[PDB]
Point group: D2
Amino acid sequence: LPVLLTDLKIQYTKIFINNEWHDSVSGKKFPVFNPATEEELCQVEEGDKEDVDKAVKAARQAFQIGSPWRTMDASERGRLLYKLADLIERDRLLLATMESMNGGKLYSNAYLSDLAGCIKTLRYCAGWADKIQGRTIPIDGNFFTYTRHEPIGVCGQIIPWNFPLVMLIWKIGPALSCGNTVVVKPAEQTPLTALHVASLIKEAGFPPGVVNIVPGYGPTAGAAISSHMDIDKVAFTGSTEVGKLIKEAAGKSNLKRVTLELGGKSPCIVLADADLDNAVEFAHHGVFYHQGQCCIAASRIFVEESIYDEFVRRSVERAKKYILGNPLTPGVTQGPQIDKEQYDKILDLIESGKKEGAKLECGGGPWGNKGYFVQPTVFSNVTDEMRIAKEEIFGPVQQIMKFKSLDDVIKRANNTFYGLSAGVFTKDIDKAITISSALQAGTVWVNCYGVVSAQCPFGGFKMSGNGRELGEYGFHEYTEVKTVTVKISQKNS
Amino acid sequence: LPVLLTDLKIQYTKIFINNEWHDSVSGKKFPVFNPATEEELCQVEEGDKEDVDKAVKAARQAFQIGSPWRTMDASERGRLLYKLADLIERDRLLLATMESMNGGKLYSNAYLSDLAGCIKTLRYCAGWADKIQGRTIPIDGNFFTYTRHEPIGVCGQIIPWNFPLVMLIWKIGPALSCGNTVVVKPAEQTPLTALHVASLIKEAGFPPGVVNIVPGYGPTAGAAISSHMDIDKVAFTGSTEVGKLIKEAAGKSNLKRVTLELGGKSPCIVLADADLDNAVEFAHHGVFYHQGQCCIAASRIFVEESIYDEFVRRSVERAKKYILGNPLTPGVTQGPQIDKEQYDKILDLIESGKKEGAKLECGGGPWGNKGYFVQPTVFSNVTDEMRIAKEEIFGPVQQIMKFKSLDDVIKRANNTFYGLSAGVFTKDIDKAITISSALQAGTVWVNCYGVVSAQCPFGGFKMSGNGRELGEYGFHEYTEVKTVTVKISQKNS
Amino acid sequence: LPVLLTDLKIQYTKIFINNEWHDSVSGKKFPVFNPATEEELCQVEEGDKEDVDKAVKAARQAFQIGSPWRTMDASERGRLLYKLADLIERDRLLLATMESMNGGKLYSNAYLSDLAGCIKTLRYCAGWADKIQGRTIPIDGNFFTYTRHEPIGVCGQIIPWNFPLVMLIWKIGPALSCGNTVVVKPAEQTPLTALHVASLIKEAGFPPGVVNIVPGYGPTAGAAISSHMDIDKVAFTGSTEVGKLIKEAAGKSNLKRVTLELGGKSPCIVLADADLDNAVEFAHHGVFYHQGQCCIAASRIFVEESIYDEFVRRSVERAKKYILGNPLTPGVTQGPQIDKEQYDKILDLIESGKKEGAKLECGGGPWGNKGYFVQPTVFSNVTDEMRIAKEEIFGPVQQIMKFKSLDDVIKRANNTFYGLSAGVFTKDIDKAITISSALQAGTVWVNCYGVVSAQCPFGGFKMSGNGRELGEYGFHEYTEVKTVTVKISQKNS
Amino acid sequence: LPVLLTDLKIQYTKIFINNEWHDSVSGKKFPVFNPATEEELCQVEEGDKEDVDKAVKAARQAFQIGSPWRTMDASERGRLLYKLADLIERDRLLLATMESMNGGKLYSNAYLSDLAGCIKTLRYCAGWADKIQGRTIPIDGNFFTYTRHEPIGVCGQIIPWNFPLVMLIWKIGPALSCGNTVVVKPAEQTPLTALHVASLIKEAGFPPGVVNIVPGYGPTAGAAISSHMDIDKVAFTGSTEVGKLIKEAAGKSNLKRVTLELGGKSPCIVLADADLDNAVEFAHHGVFYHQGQCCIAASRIFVEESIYDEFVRRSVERAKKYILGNPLTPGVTQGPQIDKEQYDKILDLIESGKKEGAKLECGGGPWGNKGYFVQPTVFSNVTDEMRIAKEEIFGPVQQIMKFKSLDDVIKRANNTFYGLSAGVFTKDIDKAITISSALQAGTVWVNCYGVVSAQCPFGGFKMSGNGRELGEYGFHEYTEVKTVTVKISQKNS
Ligand SMILES: NC(=O)C1=CN([C@@H]2O[C@H](COP(=O)(O)OP(=O)(O)OC[C@H]3O[C@@H](n4cnc5c(N)ncnc54)[C@H](O)[C@@H]3O)[C@@H](O)[C@H]2O)C=CC1
Ligand SMILES: Cc1ccccc1-n1c(SCc2cccc(F)c2)nc2n[nH]cc2c1=O
Ligand SMILES: [Cl-]
Ligand SMILES: [Cl-]
Ligand SMILES: [Cl-]
Ligand SMILES: [Cl-]
Ligand SMILES: [Yb+3]
Ligand SMILES: [Yb+3]
């Protein structure tokens, strides 16, 4: 695990449009902070409506018929993506450090996992570029019919603060491989890595206007994207609240295509026959990963009565090993929460668990003199109407619950408007297959948790989102199908 | 072209839920009229919120894990669809007559085309049932990963009055083949054929609650579907206005998946080298078909100057041959418009064409003492800011316009928030391919128009809709993908 | 289980070419016998070279560009297949009776399973007809590129005597759905059902020459197909010996495409943790089905030492319940072998098991005064170099063997030039996945055996064959891909 | 067009097995010559049976379950292929020079086209590695069924001398992306570039035994591959003669999968309405490219009478511009033929054209004092029974013929046992589509010729080969499908 052997100097702090750096139209700038110390890192140009309009004009223009981005070989789109990946690999130390410092993200994860995932996902998406194919179709009558799987056009992409880089690449990888142009709104908390990557998009040689990045706020820059009359599609990861707002803004404006990923309250079902240690470990990592700030956090763990006490005891043991501190310092195993709002939300919900009569096993309060740190907390005997069983906490707060009836627990597991993911732990083949089939969730893990890869489509059932990202299937959501039907004298099979 | 040799007796006039006929909860009924005579045909139970709630409970229950519809072979879903098609083929005379009488639809088309399309589309969709497949995926790490392409769940389906039967089958065919359950809201103008088909769904042996049909009004029964918290997906064909309302209702309620088809202002581009007669004929049929009441109506026809006068003259000649009258009487070649609202809208827009200084070639007013008949009308010298060039008329009103610059006409053709379809007429290969690629439209026809088949996906660019119906691609919009990832000791390729 | 309530009258005994019945060119006829009584059933026209030449001319002519079979809608090919299926369903009693009487096949299976499989497979294949699609491809440079998945052309299809009808439909279903024409050579033992089906192909309305059926002998009619210079492809199921001859004949003549299915020596691996009764039952059915005359017969069963004695004891118990007799008489549970050659081969191999020092648990000799009956026989303590462990017996002869080392048994299971299928019986997920991945076999069943369906591709590893039949994947082997690449002024994505 | 600024030193001259250099078992070596000067370049270890056996043992061992090549991520296979491509890009000057010197291949083409194609094809194939997916299948009954698209195993790959490097990459790219191991037999004329690439496979880090390269002769090393009992599949490009031998050897030995590409006698059809200059240019390049030594050479050009004389005159003009000489010297536009045998074959066929009464327009004899040079030669008034109209010449010998009947010329174009490719030149859409549909050829170009790319599948109809290379479709021929069917308590859709 190597490190930057030189202090991080922040350089890229402007709005990126047509491969150049722009001040905000208003002249305004906003602060960006380090969540571990609560100190300002730098000022960044604040994008708003007017800036979004500039980015959209640039992206429209880059999408025009006859432009370099439309006429270049598909394989050359792929080539540019593979080059960007190599650039990101080149600046990996730097990027991982920036991610950690701005994101409150453990550096060893930032380096070994976030940066790796970026690189690998870009490479994956690069490979798809010239393998996006339409069809020839044996339509009734004397016609030749084919389809083109075209890019959609200008895609507005709104990204959260929990995985700034991964989410950037998850959005732009697919969009660009299929031949779209994009207007990206990073989280106001975490603009910095996206702008470094913007420099690399320029260095890689993407045509100007193919990628535009407008840092700024949600009700300002975000609302302007969702309501924009010349944006063909918006993709979003974040809160359910905002998801509703994007969808409605889109309905009122130009009926743009919308896709959403909106977090979860994901359940694990642990059967008596499960490898217990394996189940405890994955379930534990599944809820605590990145300070609980994962859409897929395993925030309800149902364990069969006969092993419930053991499961609880081992889980507490495991949660009691963390060292809180600066995400940059080696051996530190838990960073802060992203900001005040998330922090207050977590403490408030922890308070509800106590009041509602859940059993506190460890943690339960804040930590330190600065940083938005929260002690890793475990509740046992949680019941299904408690706030902590129902609401996404997005903090290091694990819920453990008992079942003895299998039909009953599947129904409890499904009894949520969420449905991002789930976990099933058992050694029995039939139960692995039938439970996973019956769970209403977009990804179901068996005897593992949190395994996510570029090859697999990813997204929600129900109010956890719509559409899929990544995998072959995800690519469909960045194409628009056109059917072309030509009259002919006579067809032959 | 055979006919019913017995007067049509209307029989099915109730709400269809769990394979039984129900009165409205309120006890209310509404009238259904014949558009050709303006006389009431019968009374039909008026579904509203409460009735939609009953249908949704039935459809949820039929979708439950372990139910007959979830556990039966995929091939048996297909078998039921092929059986329904045979039933519809059995009652073809009757259905075509009901469609014509209630829909104001020419009987020869109703029989030879609408009924045929229903039958053929059901058969197409039946064949897909056991060929809906997921994937096995060579994910990073030691895991086995597969996807299931599951049904979504309860699908609310809102249908217009222009093609009552075709639209019913376009909705239920795909939905059912993939294994969904459905709640169908037919157009208040045209409930009758859908309820006959409901009797046939029962006779075919679909499990109760797989198909439910709730006749009723849009702001009542329709709004209840769009806003319903236990409906997983709504599909809609109709007005842009309502499309916006569905999308926003869905955003506010449970973020249900939405797909929309919303009409158009579809352009044809006719080049000097075109087969002129062929172009005039298809363009003519492309705008006049079913009294102009087609989403794909070719409502802007751009013709190269050097053949523009000829194109106009032949088009007028062609439009002057129609015989208006009862859609049931043989030799009648133009029925009425569906109702008062559409009628007033058409006359109003015709009036705007006159006032705005378009050239009237023929028609321009109403016809007859009853029925909502409108004379087939042609405007030449139409310009791009005239209301008749911009707004979907949905009446027998053809617009013809001149161009001489090809780059310019592609831009005029694309300069619309619509994008359902287009037509290109030329003998030059390069122009056929490059123009069709550059047109922003979901289907582009070359040297033909209005060719639509079960094998081809169908839908809009831009504000003409989202998602695709039919073809392989359409089937994707009725599945929800679940990724299942199993930990294994060691994988091998 | 209903029966024909009328004696079977044989009617169709001629060569079928261009939808008409032809005498053999030579005037010769050959006998067809009932394997249960050894009595001649009828005489059938003997096809030879000259007759095959007539069928190939007919099939070539039906495949010509512009013919009805090439120009008809794909959906109409499908329609004809679905109609044939309905006809076969209509004559199911008759066909099942003919199959049983000529094939020595238990009537209850003939009716409930062979006839059902025919019908269901035809329906499956009918659904694919208009869903065979090519691609549009984003090739480098300014070109439009698409592929057509055309039919290959004239396909020669050589069928065995064990599943005459199923194999006929497995060959013609796919071939016809994709739009090929065919020349079918049924087994000399079992021409009769194929010719009844030929009458039904005519009644369904297939264009003449689309299906031609030439009954006759292998070195005569078969060799003429394999060596024919105007046959584009030969498909074959049967012996390894003949498979080699087909492939070499094809190499010397016109390099026609070849696909082969050639039987097996398929292994089951039964782990200590297996549901024992379930494993014994499926393994038992897996070897005894149709008098052992299945390509997939589970002819080596490796059982973990600790349950080996139990497994053996229960298996013997099960094998001792059969009633031998006329396949037509209800309650009869084992018919005769097809003929003298197979009979002698089975007895000879049984003799080798005794001599080589395998343990005889039951059976071991012939039965009855007529018919080619063989007692159901079980060997335990079989070892890997015994003839009965190595050679396909194709008789009711079950081999049971012991293992204790799992790595070792996978290697023993794979140590064969065959590889059609295998079975794994365990309750452990990891073992189910890793064993099945490691077995070199085309289909691997887990906790079952002999489950074969139209939706699944089917074929061999190694010397058990090449290519796949059925499923989506099988359809590929009946298409020829043509790439069409058009120069264009400028492409756009 | 840069050059090596340093004389080419030959270094790699051994047999490559398990990532190490081996002498021939026999100790024998054979000469390798430069076709332009007829001088020996070096000696190379002569592989034979015994050496092929060593390579096959290495490749089997590398394919074993649990080996690094089987267990590594698919994405990592892809990573290794992309790395090899970068290495080849690194040594591009060197490789292009080696190709030109050993292959008699124009250096500017070697560099700008062969080397480019290698690089681009490797990159294409790298992208497929982790996108090779199987299916989950909704089989009848209570089962879970999936397919794995596994690698086949050990693939023997026999390569010709016309495109040594391109053919190497066309074989290994796909094979390796899918996860096979390979035993490559380069052409005895042209081993040298393949062994340089072998050094790069080692430097890239492929596991030992994944790629093995055995230089040597056809009846020795080649026959040993085709007849080898532990080689799962052989792929071959070359003569029809040898193709027959491979197929038959495979039939007799272990029934290994075979695919073949075997050259052609590819026709162009030029209609009166064609862009004449464009047609003359592409047709000209289509026959003369690389001294006529292309499988796809446009060796029969049918031109409509009314433009035939013009077409001929312009074609002669074009053929008369070549400068023959050392393929390394800039401005040289035609190299020698590969060797004596090809040279004699070309002269002999030229002699037949004269004798049979074809009209000689230019060329007709050899050139120079050394090298196997042949003057670029054009025949007009060629007729369909002349040897030069029927036999693949594989020399710079163009045939031009007249037609006036379109139905007739399609039949003449198809009247050949070949079918690799064809060209159609016209401005009419209908004719482009209907002619290309009617031509019996694997690739059909419209208004171009010789456009071949990694994205498009490539191969023959009829005796021009079987199976396809490259594109999505080509990848199928390097997988073996296994169906896995698991018994379950109850399935749900
Ligand atoms: N894969 C399977 O399901 C089958 C496997 N077999 C195996 O083959 C063994 C021998 O049985 P046979 O009946 O002799 O099978 P076989 O392979 O000779 O007969 C099957 C078909 O091939 C034809 N045939 C025979 N000689 C031919 C030739 N020279 N050219 C072209 N076609 C020819 C036959 O006329 C028949 O239509 C069996 O004991 C069994 O192990 C036999 C039948 C089916
Ligand atoms: C597949 C099936 C459907 C319906 C009823 C029974 C079966 N079936 C069979 S069928 C054997 C067969 C028939 C044709 C081709 C083949 F490759 C194999 N073979 C079997 N062997 N052992 C159990 C079997 C079975 O259940
Ligand atoms: Cl998928
Ligand atoms: Cl498509
Ligand atoms: Cl498959
Ligand atoms: Cl393809
Ligand atoms: Yb006897
Ligand atoms: Yb010489």
